[PDB]
Amino acid sequence: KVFGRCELAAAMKRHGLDNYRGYSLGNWVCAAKFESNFNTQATNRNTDGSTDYGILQINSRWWCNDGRTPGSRNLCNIPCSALLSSDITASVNCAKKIVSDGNGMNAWVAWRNRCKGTDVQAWIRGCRL
Numbered sequence: 001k002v003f004g005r006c007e008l009a010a011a012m013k014r015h016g017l018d019n020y021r022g023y024s025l026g027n028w029v030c031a032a033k034f035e036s037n038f039n040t041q042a043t044n045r046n047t048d049g050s051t052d053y054g055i056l057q058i059n060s061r062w063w064c065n066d067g068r069t070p071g072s073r074n075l076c077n078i079p080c081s082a083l084l085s086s087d088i089t090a091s092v093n094c095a096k097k098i099v100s101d102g103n104g105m106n107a108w109v110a111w112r113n114r115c116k117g118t119d120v121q122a123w124i125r126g127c128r129l
């Protein structure tokens with residue numbers, strides 16, 4: 001499904017992402033906007049044979065196993081199919097692991113290039129959280 005901005009903000013806050021590992025909620029909402037345009041079903045194929053899945057575009061080479069990616073490490077220990085659900089729990093749980101591995105939100109290029117450096121709290125402005 002396609003989430004609305006405040007709708008996603010509320011779901012992410014309920015899932016403990018606000019200020020997780022030092023990243024305020026706005027960062028996560030901004031990343032999702034530019035990574036998948038708030039669509040839980042977005043997929044992107046990469047040159048290395050990997051694919052990015054879901055609202056947070058989680059990669060199959062390191063994080064989830066999709067069964068067609070060479071050198072897959074499955075660090076979140078979940079099939080990539082689970083990250084295409086309308087429910088964001090699995091994606092969020094994996095996202096928490098990705099940010100904890102020691103490089104914060106730099107794993108997400110859309111966040112890195114289009115969110116970082118801007119006023120990200122503007123992404124949750126107007127929402128009841």
Ligand SMILES: [Cl-]
Pocket residue numbers: 065066067079080081082
């Ligand atoms: Cl899969």
